[PDB]
Amino acid sequence: PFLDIQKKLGISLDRHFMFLSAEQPYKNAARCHAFEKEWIECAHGIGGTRAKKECKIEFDDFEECLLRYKTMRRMHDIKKQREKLMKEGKYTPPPHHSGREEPRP
Amino acid sequence: AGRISAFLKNAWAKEPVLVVSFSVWGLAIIMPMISPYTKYASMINKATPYNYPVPVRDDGNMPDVPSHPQDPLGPSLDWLKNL
Amino acid sequence: MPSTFFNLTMAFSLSLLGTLMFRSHLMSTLLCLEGMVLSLFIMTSVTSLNSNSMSSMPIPITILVFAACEAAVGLALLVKVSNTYGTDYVQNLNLLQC
Amino acid sequence: MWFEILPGLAIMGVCLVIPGVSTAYIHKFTNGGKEKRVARVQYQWYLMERDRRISGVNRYYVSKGLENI
Amino acid sequence: YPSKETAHWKPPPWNDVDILKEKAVTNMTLNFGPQHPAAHGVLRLVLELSGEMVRKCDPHIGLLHRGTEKLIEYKTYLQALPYFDRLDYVSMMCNEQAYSIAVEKLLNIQPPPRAQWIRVLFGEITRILNHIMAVTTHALDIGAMTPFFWMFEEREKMFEFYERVSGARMHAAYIRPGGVHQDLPLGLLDDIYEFSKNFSLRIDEV
Amino acid sequence: RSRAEYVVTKLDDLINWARRSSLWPMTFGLACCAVEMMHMAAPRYDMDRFGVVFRASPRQADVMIVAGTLTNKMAPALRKVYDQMPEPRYVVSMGSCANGGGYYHYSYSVVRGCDRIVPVDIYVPGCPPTAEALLYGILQLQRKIKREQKLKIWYRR
Amino acid sequence: MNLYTVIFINILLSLTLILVAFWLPQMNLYSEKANPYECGFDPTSSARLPFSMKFFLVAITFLLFDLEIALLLPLPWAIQTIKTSTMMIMAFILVTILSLGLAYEWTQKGLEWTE
Amino acid sequence: MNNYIFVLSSLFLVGCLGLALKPSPIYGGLGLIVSGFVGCLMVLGFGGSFLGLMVFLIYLGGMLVVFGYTTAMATEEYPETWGSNWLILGFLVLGVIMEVFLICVLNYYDEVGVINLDGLGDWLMYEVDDVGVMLEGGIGVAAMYSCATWMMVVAGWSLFAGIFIIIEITRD
Amino acid sequence: MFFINILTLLVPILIAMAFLTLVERKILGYMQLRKGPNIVGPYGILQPFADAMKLFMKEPMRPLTTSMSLFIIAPTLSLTLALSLWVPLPMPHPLINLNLGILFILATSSLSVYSILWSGWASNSKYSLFGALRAVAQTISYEVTMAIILLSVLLMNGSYSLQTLITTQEHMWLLLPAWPMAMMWFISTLAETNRAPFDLTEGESELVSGFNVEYAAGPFALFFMAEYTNIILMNALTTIIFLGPLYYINLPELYSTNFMMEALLLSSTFLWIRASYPRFRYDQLMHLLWKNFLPLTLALCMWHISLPIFTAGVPPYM
Amino acid sequence: RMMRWNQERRRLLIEDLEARIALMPLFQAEKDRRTLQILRENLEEEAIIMKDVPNWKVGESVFHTTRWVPPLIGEMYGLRTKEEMSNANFGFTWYT
Numbered sequence A: 001p002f003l004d005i006q007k008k009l010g011i012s013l014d015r016h017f018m019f020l021s022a023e024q025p026y027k028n029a030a031r032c033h034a035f036e037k038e039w040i041e042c043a044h045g046i047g048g049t050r051a052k053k054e055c056k057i058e059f060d061d062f063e064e065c066l067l068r069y070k071t072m073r074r075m076h077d078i079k080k081q082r083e084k085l086m087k088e089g090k091y092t093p094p095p096h097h098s099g100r101e102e103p104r105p
Numbered sequence B: 001a002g003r004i005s006a007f008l009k010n011a012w013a014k015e016p017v018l019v020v021s022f023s024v025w026g027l028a029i030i031m032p033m034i035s036p037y038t039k040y041a042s043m044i045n046k047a048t049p050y051n052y053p054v055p056v057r058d059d060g061n062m063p064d065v066p067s068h069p070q071d072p073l074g075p076s077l078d079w080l081k082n083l
Numbered sequence C: 001m002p003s004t005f006f007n008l009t010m011a012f013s014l015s016l017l018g019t020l021m022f023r024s025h026l027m028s029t030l031l032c033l034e035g036m037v038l039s040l041f042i043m044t045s046v047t048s049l050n051s052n053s054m055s056s057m058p059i060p061i062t063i064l065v066f067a068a069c070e071a072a073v074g075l076a077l078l079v080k081v082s083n084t085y086g087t088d089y090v091q092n093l094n095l096l097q098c
Numbered sequence D: 001m002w003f004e005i006l007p008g009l010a011i012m013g014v015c016l017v018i019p020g021v022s023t024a025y026i027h028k029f030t031n032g033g034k035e036k037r038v039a040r041v042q043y044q045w046y047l048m049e050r051d052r053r054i055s056g057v058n059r060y061y062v063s064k065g066l067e068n069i
Numbered sequence E: 001y002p003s004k005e006t007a008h009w010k011p012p013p014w015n016d017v018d019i020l021k022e023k024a025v026t027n028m029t030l031n032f033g034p035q036h037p038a039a040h041g042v043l044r045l046v047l048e049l050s051g052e053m054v055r056k057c058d059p060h061i062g063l064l065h066r067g068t069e070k071l072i073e074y075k076t077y078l079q080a081l082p083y084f085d086r087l088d089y090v091s092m093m094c095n096e097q098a099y100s101i102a103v104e105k106l107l108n109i110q111p112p113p114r115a116q117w118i119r120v121l122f123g124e125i126t127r128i129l130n131h132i133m134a135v136t137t138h139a140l141d142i143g144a145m146t147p148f149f150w151m152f153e154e155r156e157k158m159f160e161f162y163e164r165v166s167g168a169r170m171h172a173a174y175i176r177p178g179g180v181h182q183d184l185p186l187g188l189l190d191d192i193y194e195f196s197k198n199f200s201l202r203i204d205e206v
Numbered sequence F: 001r002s003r004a005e006y007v008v009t010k011l012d013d014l015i016n017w018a019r020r021s022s023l024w025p026m027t028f029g030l031a032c033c034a035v036e037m038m039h040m041a042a043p044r045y046d047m048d049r050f051g052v053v054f055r056a057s058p059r060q061a062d063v064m065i066v067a068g069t070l071t072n073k074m075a076p077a078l079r080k081v082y083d084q085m086p087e088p089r090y091v092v093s094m095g096s097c098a099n100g101g102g103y104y105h106y107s108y109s110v111v112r113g114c115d116r117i118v119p120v121d122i123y124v125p126g127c128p129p130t131a132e133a134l135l136y137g138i139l140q141l142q143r144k145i146k147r148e149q150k151l152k153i154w155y156r157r
Numbered sequence G: 001m002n003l004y005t006v007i008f009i010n011i012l013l014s015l016t017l018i019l020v021a022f023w024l025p026q027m028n029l030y031s032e033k034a035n036p037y038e039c040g041f042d043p044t045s046s047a048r049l050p051f052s053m054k055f056f057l058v059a060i061t062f063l064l065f066d067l068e069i070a071l072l073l074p075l076p077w078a079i080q081t082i083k084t085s086t087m088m089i090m091a092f093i094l095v096t097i098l099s100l101g102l103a104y105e106w107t108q109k110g111l112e113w114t115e
Numbered sequence H: 001m002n003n004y005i006f007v008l009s010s011l012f013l014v015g016c017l018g019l020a021l022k023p024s025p026i027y028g029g030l031g032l033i034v035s036g037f038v039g040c041l042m043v044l045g046f047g048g049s050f051l052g053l054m055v056f057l058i059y060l061g062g063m064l065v066v067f068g069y070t071t072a073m074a075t076e077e078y079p080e081t082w083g084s085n086w087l088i089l090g091f092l093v094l095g096v097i098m099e100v101f102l103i104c105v106l107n108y109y110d111e112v113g114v115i116n117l118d119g120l121g122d123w124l125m126y127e128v129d130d131v132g133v134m135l136e137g138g139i140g141v142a143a144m145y146s147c148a149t150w151m152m153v154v155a156g157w158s159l160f161a162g163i164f165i166i167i168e169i170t171r172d
Numbered sequence I: 001m002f003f004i005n006i007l008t009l010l011v012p013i014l015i016a017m018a019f020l021t022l023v024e025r026k027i028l029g030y031m032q033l034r035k036g037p038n039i040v041g042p043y044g045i046l047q048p049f050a051d052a053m054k055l056f057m058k059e060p061m062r063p064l065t066t067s068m069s070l071f072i073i074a075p076t077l078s079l080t081l082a083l084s085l086w087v088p089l090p091m092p093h094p095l096i097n098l099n100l101g102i103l104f105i106l107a108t109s110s111l112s113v114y115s116i117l118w119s120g121w122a123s124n125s126k127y128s129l130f131g132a133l134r135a136v137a138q139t140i141s142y143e144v145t146m147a148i149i150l151l152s153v154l155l156m157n158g159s160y161s162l163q164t165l166i167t168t169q170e171h172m173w174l175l176l177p178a179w180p181m182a183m184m185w186f187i188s189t190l191a192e193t194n195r196a197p198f199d200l201t202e203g204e205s206e207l208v209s210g211f212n213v214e215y216a217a218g219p220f221a222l223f224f225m226a227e228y229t230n231i232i233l234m235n236a237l238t239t240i241i242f243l244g245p246l247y248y249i250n251l252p253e254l255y256s257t258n259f260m261m262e263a264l265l266l267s268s269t270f271l272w273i274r275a276s277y278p279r280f281r282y283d284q285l286m287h288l289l290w291k292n293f294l295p296l297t298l299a300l301c302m303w304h305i306s307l308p309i310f311t312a313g314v315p316p317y318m
Numbered sequence J: 001r002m003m004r005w006n007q008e009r010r011r012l013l014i015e016d017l018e019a020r021i022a023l024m025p026l027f028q029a030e031k032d033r034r035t036l037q038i039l040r041e042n043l044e045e046e047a048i049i050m051k052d053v054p055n056w057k058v059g060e061s062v063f064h065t066t067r068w069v070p071p072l073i074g075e076m077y078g079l080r081t082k083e084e085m086s087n088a089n090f091g092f093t094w095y096t
């Protein structure tokens, strides 16, 4: 912060709920807790400029976990290729993908 | 303090609602400080297990941790059973 | 989530466009501010739910608390405007050009 | 006389017992002779879904005891 | 720097206070009655209102003006008497008594003793009839509907005293210059006594 | 006649019965005659036990009881509230003043009978009619409504 | 699904009654019948003109007091906390300042309606 | 049911378009009430409960005050609706057409970007703790009383100071 | 089967509403030394059906100054919301089991005021506008304390779930520990239902008919049906919150019978109150709530936060 | 009386929550196997559906890291019926 009063007094008015990995009620981890913990820990102590290049792996993973652009696209591609094959009559979904599974347990 | 007593008596006769409101407000603050059961309310919230108690790896240096849930080690709840 | 957040951002943009493009009533503009508040509340709430961020759920409530204070002051000002001119029209609020 | 008010009251009284009684009976009829399950929390929903999956007939309320293992 | 656009600008006021044209008084004007529960069916009370604050009451009357006073000029004195029943038509016999006394004065005659006691007796029965209507309808306008019903059953019994002396429940035409039209039927005083000894309890309930 | 005519006739009875049984007069009274109207509502006669309930709004009223003298100054207002009653609507003229001007028939300021202003279904004589005489007229209006044949006439058109 | 189903039936029942009420009865539309009611005389102005609000200050106070109760409605979940003393102080302080705010407005005559 | 949340967020968008056109504040107030209800449904749809019901309750109270203020200080002889003015009506219709166009085109160019009409319903709930107990949104809000007390201090101060502020603004 | 259950809630509630119009008119009559309806059916039991058939056979108003969309919508919204308030009511098992059923009630009840506000505004007449602005004032009066009163009670319940109130009261009426809140709650439900002595939005002695003055025929009947349904609802709610009917897991119908008896009694006191008191002035209702109920409600909320902590009596979350 | 009854209701809740604790290991093991089997089934159909697609790697992660990433609901039920997907999105929240 512009004035680091909280750090000087050693208190926490708003430092402890700043990101996903922070403490949650009843220890219910937020989505992408492990990815955000890895990104924050990679970046610690080296500054923002270096962190941008050198923690790029961690940020991309966390970004994928949270926003899920690649996961959505990959499923869109599989479901689109399945639509093409079924119209051509070359693919038949199995019974467990058609609602006739043998449920577990 | 005879001047206030006449004041309080008049307020009781003429503005009883406000007298009750202030008295109830003052009692609500006072009661937790003088009650012997105040300490248990936090202890009861602390004994409610909403989460799975994850076991610890035994390293051979845990004389205080039970090895079974019916070992005589660990936190007892006899205080609550007889509350 | 993807399409819902797009629509919510568009809803904010429309409410802001409403705020920026005055008609006559000041009250109609005060309603557009409440529209932006409402959009931002849902966006914050949906984000917290989608990420399971329970420590952030106080924040949407604080958004509404200060919006209520903003709306109360806006209405209080509107009483003053109406007392001066007998309407809430913004074209009367032009004495400070000179 | 005042007791001539009672025919309307009795009709009111009968009409106000039917909703409670009918809901309780229709629940048992549609939940295998038991109370309709209440899923206040996700854990309870999970148990119902597991009950539905092991039932063999896709109904959570058809229960399986030790005869099934 | 003067410009064509800003040629009409004046300097602001020295104390920042502008003299603006007088703002428009915009009170709501409302017809309260004649067709209104509180208007007695014939009062057109024109109200100036600010919110529900009443700024002016302008009562428009004459919606029951029937020209009684002109009509009386074409009547004999006895023929005019029933017009007085229909003035304060809640206090019928008292209106008769006023007109009877005025005529008796101009005639320089007096009504006999028993007539005067009857006239006071029924004058005070009439006052109760009036105060019941005054109190309970006033309560009914304020929302307390029930006292109207208890006390109008008492009124119905007093209408029977009217009908027993005169044959009419309301417009008796019973008090006339010179006394009253007929003497009391046998048994009327006893029934007035029976009513009178219970009425104060009816007042206590209200 | 036919079974379609029989059914129509029974429906006339049903709708007629409903309007008979729930007559809501306007809270509307002009002079002394209105006092006797209060006495019909009072406990001895209790008009509400027949289903008769005053409502102040003309939009929620079925009957206008012209209970008192109708002056020229009042006539437009009475016509207005009559026009603002939804149909089907009925008028009961109560007392000599409303019936034909009564004691004030020859006045410059008085309408000689409210039936110069509105249509009238029942004329109740008296000055005032007793609460019971008014109640009799209300029960005569109910029997008039019982005779309405609007659906039978529609069927035969 | 069930909550959606019953509320739609509630909407469906209400709208059917409205349609019956508008298409069953015999009508007779004419101007004097449909003019606005005002006790038998014509209105002298529109009902759409400004209507003064004498309790306007209580009204905007109600806006703030309605967000105060919104801050109080999590209390059933908050009493489950281990940090009972913290929760209790926060709730006590919150209620007390709201009382002081009401007390100030009361003594400033802010609850009195304007004349 | 796979279109449920998109339909709701689409209804919400129309409500804000109606508000943005600024008819008489009477209908503006109604527009926010409907949008608030639709917004409550969206929060519910994403697994919310307390937050959705709060915002509707708060906006029900808020628009009742605005109704009262509108009848006193923001009213004209002929209040405008959305249909009253051809120009406002046209931009209402054009705005709805431009919404269909914007969603249609964005679906074509990316197909999975901002708009993914093929995948609607597949990406609403991401993760859910299946066997959990303490998970409802009210628990999160209640942290103001224990773990996020600073959030409640500032919220409480603003309401308290708001009383003193509005009393000062409104005195003559 | 769920559709049959909807019928066996809605239809009996609508018949209960219709006969409450009869019970009100007879109870008021007898307190006034009259009889009330006793001709239209035996002891007047067909009088509600006659009034219903009359109204829906009557010409409905189409006033010229009226803004017609809101004019039609408002009575439609009124009956919808009145019926919707019943679906989460546990008697002892609800049709719809809601986690935050109490908050559902407040939100639904709070939307109900807009039927009054919009009908009065849409009618575009002076007496209807007066009635609408009294509704604005009425809600500001009571809504400020109604939710805090509920809040304090539910700190002994431990949740917003209506079904949990049954278990909370297994051994004792909530009346006993909460009677001061029960008293304030009871006055609030009278104002919330626009009932005497707070029948101000209609108040016929002052505004002729207030918000619904321009309404006729079947549209008028919807407002009346909605008002009488809400009276039963609010008293049934008072019964479940404070007067916990006796519950036994193997005798559910015992709860329903006991619930009905107490709900019938609380509805009778509503009619009894109407027959007894004059009307408040609508500025005086605001002062009653904001200068008497609100101070005590705030003190008692603080007391009911304090109580479970210092008695170690926090109710369970589940 | 409320103090005593609520103290009893707190003891009952602990007993109920302790029954859940005892059973949670079994539910965790079942859920692990169920999730993995569903993911396995998706992988086999991906091997057939994406057979003749250039540059497609069957089973490829979208992440650099090699630690286990739990699947999303969209991933698990992406290839199954609309009802199974709707039940996962709305089952609990629409059960009343």
Ligand SMILES: CCCCCCCCCCCCO[C@@H]1O[C@H](CO)[C@@H](O[C@H]2O[C@H](CO)[C@@H](O)[C@H](O)[C@H]2O)[C@H](O)[C@H]1O
Pocket (backbone or CB within 6 Å): G026, G027, G028, G029, G030
């Ligand atoms: C593609 C276009 C198709 C052709 C469209 C033709 C439309 C013509 C509609 C004619 C009107 C019908 O609409 C209806 O008319 C009747 C009588 O006519 C009137 O209805 C009411 O008012 C009048 C007033 O005197 C009474 O005579 C009538 O008995 C009553 O029912 C109303 O005006 C309307 O309810």
Ligand SMILES: CCCCCCCCCCCCO[C@@H]1O[C@H](CO)[C@@H](O[C@H]2O[C@H](CO)[C@@H](O)[C@H](O)[C@H]2O)[C@H](O)[C@H]1O
Pocket (backbone or CB within 6 Å): B029, B032, B033, B038, B039, B040, B041, B042, B043, G084, G085, G086, G088, G089, G092, G093, G096, G097, I309
């Ligand atoms: C200007 C605004 C003024 C209004 C605000 C005033 C707030 C002040 C509150 C004073 C009361 C605090 O009351 C305090 O309650 C807590 C629990 O809540 C008690 O705390 C006790 O019980 C708790 C459990 O809850 C134990 O963990 C603790 O060790 C024990 O002290 C304190 O003994 C008592 O002192």
Ligand SMILES: CCCCCCCCCCCCO[C@@H]1O[C@H](CO)[C@@H](O[C@H]2O[C@H](CO)[C@@H](O)[C@H](O)[C@H]2O)[C@H](O)[C@H]1O
Pocket (backbone or CB within 6 Å): A079, A083, H002, H003, H006, H007, H010, H011, H117, H118, H119, H120, H121, H122
């Ligand atoms: C104000 C109201 C606005 C209404 C807005 C429009 C509502 C209707 C939404 C249409 C959007 C697409 O709606 C629907 O999306 C689903 C995903 O859930 C698609 O899903 C389905 O078809 C597509 C291929 O065609 C594949 O994903 C797959 O075969 C199947 O899941 C549907 O084919 C599409 O029709």
Ligand SMILES: CCCCCCCCCCCCO[C@@H]1O[C@H](CO)[C@@H](O[C@H]2O[C@H](CO)[C@@H](O)[C@H](O)[C@H]2O)[C@H](O)[C@H]1O
Pocket (backbone or CB within 6 Å): A011, A012, A013, A016, A023, H146, H147, H148, H149, H150, H153
């Ligand atoms: C000038 C005006 C400002 C002065 C008035 C305000 C005074 C401050 C009052 C608010 C005090 C907040 O006090 C602060 O509380 C939080 C919890 O909420 C504590 O936070 C502590 O517990 C949390 C629980 O999650 C941990 O995550 C955190 O790491 C730890 O520090 C802080 O250690 C304490 O400093």
Ligand code: SF4
Pocket (backbone or CB within 6 Å): E086, E089, F031, F032, F033, F034, F067, F068, F069, F094, F095, F096, F097, F098, F102, F103, F126, F127, F128, F129
């Ligand atoms: S008829 Fe007789 S009683 Fe009736 S108003 Fe005329 S004078 Fe009075």
